[PDB]
Design an enzyme around this catalytic site. Structure first.
Site, PDB file in Angstrom:
ATOM      1  N   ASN A  55       0.831  -1.210   0.000  1.00 27.01           N
ATOM      2  CA  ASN A  55       0.000   0.000   0.000  1.00 27.01           C
ATOM      3  C   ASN A  55       0.865   1.259   0.000  1.00 27.01           C
ATOM      4  OD1 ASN A  55      -2.444   1.401   0.240  1.00 27.01           O
ATOM      5  ND2 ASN A  55      -2.234   1.580   2.481  1.00 27.01           N
ATOM      6  N   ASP A  99       5.764  -4.998   2.232  1.00 23.62           N
ATOM      7  CA  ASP A  99       4.561  -4.380   2.845  1.00 23.62           C
ATOM      8  C   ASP A  99       3.378  -5.345   2.791  1.00 23.62           C
ATOM      9  OD1 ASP A  99       3.386  -1.874   4.099  1.00 23.62           O
ATOM     10  OD2 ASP A  99       2.042  -2.109   2.347  1.00 23.62           O
ATOM     11  N   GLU A 141      10.973  -4.718   4.311  1.00 25.50           N
ATOM     12  CA  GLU A 141       9.948  -3.817   4.866  1.00 25.50           C
ATOM     13  C   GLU A 141       8.587  -4.509   4.905  1.00 25.50           C
ATOM     14  OE1 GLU A 141       9.719  -0.520   6.339  1.00 25.50           O
ATOM     15  OE2 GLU A 141      11.658  -1.355   7.020  1.00 25.50           O
TER      16      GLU A 141
END
Ligand code: CL
Length: 291
Positions: free
Chosen positions: A35, A105, A129
């Site tokens: 996102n 993500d 991440e």
């Protein structure tokens, strides 16, 4: 010049068009964005894998050049619904065996959950991440993002996202060390240019992040795949970010205990593909070649 939108292929999934990049032949190397991004996030990393396999970078439902859902509202675009569309797309594309996943993500929530439920189909997982824990407390949430996420998860969220598009307009540039060019930023804006429900995926996602056991379904499935990641011998490439955002501090120490793990560190906050694409691409290429 050939634009990014122009290079996309399309598949019909539960009656909705899903866009994706596909190039090359061989076993699949599947790049999953999160996102509020799209397959465009992988544009500078994919060339490092050219000729190494069948490169696939889908746009999640409601994002990139994929269709928007009908009568979108606050119950739309949950993690479960993203699984429904993405997992069906992957089956349609014959992504079933010897799969290399390159994930970030919410693309990592999807990819780790896919790998967990298709554990014999996976050649390796490169992640960065990523969603690698559930948070028992808001104290554990990234300091730079806490006020924003608390407000998104509140009734304020609709105005912040549907009207003001703040996930795109504030969180994106806040999560990159460099400045995106006007062209690059306009490509991230493009799927969300229209005010209202077109922007809903960027609001449901922050509301789906597992914090204090809510949502319950996401909490349970993340906990389940994280337990499994600490045991599975599937090769793992951890692309650590400096300073990073989601994977820092204690979390990072826990990731470093996972089996069969290779670690590379690159400069970045959260959308690290925008700061260190060549370092990430080279690391993924070299690691994939060693499998
Ligand atoms: Cl989010």
């Amino acid at each position: 010049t050939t634009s990014f939108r122009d290079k996309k292929k399309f598949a019909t999934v539960h009656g909705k068009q899903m866009a994706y990049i596909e190039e090359g032949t061989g076993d699949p190397i599947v790049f999953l964005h999160g996102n509020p991004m799209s397959s465009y996030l992988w544009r500078n990393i994919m060339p490092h894998l050219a000729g190494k396999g069948r490169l696939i970078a889908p746009d999640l439902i409601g994002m990139g050049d994929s269709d928007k859902l009908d009568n979108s509202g606050p119950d739309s675009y949950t993690f479960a619904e993203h699984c429904t569309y993405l997992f069906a797309l992957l089956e349609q594309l014959g992504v079933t065996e010897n799969v290399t996943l390159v994930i970030h993500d919410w693309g990592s929530g999807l990819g780790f959950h896919w790998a967990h439920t298709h554990s014999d189909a996976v050649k390796g997982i490169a992640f960065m991440e990523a969603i690698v824990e559930t948070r028992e407390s808001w104290d554990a949430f990234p300091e730079r993002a806490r006020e924003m996420f608390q407000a998104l998860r509140s009734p304020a969220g609709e105005e912040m996202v549907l009207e003001k598009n703040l996930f795109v307009e504030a969180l994106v540039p806040g999560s990159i060390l460099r400045d995106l060019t006007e062209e690059e930023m306009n490509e991230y804006r493009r799927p969300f240019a229209n005010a209202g429900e077109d922007r809903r995926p960027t609001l449901t996602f922050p509301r789906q992040v597992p914090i204090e056991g809510q949502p319950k379904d996401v909490t349970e499935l993340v906990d389940a795949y994280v337990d499994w990641l600490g045991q599975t011998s599937i090769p793992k490439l951890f692309i650590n970010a400096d300073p990073g955002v989601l994977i820092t501090g204690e979390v990072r120490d826990r990731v470093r205990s996972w089996p069969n793990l290779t670690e590379v560190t690159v400069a970045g906050l959260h959308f690290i593909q925008e700061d260190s694409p060549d370092e990430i691409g080279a690391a993924v290429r070299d690691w994939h070649a060693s499998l």
